[PDB]
């Protein structure tokens, strides 16, 4: 449950 | 098989990993990587950054095991050990925060 960040994808 | 890491820290906590980032002086792109407080089994890549807002801060992604072995935080970046994950993400932030600049001192 704690926050973690994604790597964010572009198309 | 070769057998060899600074920038492990085992069981590890986030909120005890952050003080250890934290620290005066580090840089943005500081890290270490710990055994997951939440996914059992999974690892976490903890990363000191900034911004205007937060000021100092954290970072945490989760590095995902792949079922019959190898890690990715992104699943179009895979990687047979923690090592090459860590060798790769040092060369190119690739999607992270930055790049991992220097591991926990
Ligand atoms: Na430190």
Same mark, same amino acid.
């Given at each position: 449950?704690?926050?973690?960040?994604? %790597?964010? %994808?572009?198309? | 098989?070769?057998?060899?890491?600074?920038?492990?820290?085992?069981?590890? @906590?986030?909120?005890?990993?952050?003080?250890?980032?934290?620290?005066?002086?580090?840089?943005?792109?500081?890290?270490?990587?710990?055994?997951?407080?939440?996914?059992?089994?999974?690892?976490?890549?903890?990363?000191?950054?900034?911004?205007?807002?937060? @000021?100092?801060?954290?970072?945490?992604?989760?590095?995902?095991?792949?079922?019959? @072995? @190898?890690?990715?935080?992104?699943?179009?970046?895979?990687?047979?050990?923690?090592?090459?994950?860590?060798?790769?993400?040092?060369?190119?932030?690739?999607?992270?925060?930055?790049?991992?600049?220097?591991?926990?001192?």
């Amino acid at each position: 449950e704690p926050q973690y960040e994604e %790597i964010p %994808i572009y198309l | 098989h070769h057998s060899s890491m600074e920038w492990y820290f085992g069981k590890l @906590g986030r909120k005890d990993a952050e003080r250890q980032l934290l620290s005066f002086g580090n840089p943005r792109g500081t890290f270490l990587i710990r055994e997951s407080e939440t996914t059992k089994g999974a690892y976490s890549l903890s990363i000191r950054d900034w911004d205007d807002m937060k @000021g100092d801060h954290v970072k945490h992604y989760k590095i995902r095991k792949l079922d019959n @072995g @190898g890690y990715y935080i992104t699943t179009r970046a895979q990687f047979e050990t923690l090592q090459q994950l860590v060798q790769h993400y040092s060369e190119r932030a690739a999607g992270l925060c930055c790049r991992l600049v220097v591991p926990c001192h």
